[PDB]
Design a protein around this nucleic acid. Structure first.
Ligand code: NA
Length: 91
DNA sequence: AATAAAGGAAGTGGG
DNA sequence: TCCCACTTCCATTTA
């Protein structure tokens, strides 16, 4: 099953939910969620995973925070903004 | 107040 | 057995 960081990177590459997520500086791997349209993207993540409950942005962001230690995704000090590691971007 | 963004603990999956 | 990679739940802080 796909990992959350890969699901997000793939969306950014495909542009399929451009109103929910976008690159801020793709060279740096920084990206930002839409305040008003992030829930639709969270719903898609839960459906793709086949989870029992409806996924919310809050639960998705709870998972994202767990990457901060290992480094795949880090929170940036800007609203709704995160950053992929160089290793994730390269792979 | 109303709204919104921003981790400890225990449960679930598939090894 | 016991970690993976989250998921779910609940609570708190700041703006
Ligand atoms: Na929020």
């Amino acid at each position: 099953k796909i990992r959350l960081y890969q699901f997000l990177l793939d969306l950014l590459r495909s542009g399929d939910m451009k109103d929910s997520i976008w690159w801020v500086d793709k060279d740096k791997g920084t990206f930002q969620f839409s305040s008003k349209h992030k829930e639709a993207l969270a719903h898609r993540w839960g459906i793709q995973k086949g989870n029992r409950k409806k996924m919310t942005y809050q639960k998705m962001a709870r998972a994202l925070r767990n990457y901060g230690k290992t480094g795949e995704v880090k929170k940036v000090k800007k609203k709704l903004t995160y950053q992929f590691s160089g290793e994730v971007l390269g792979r």
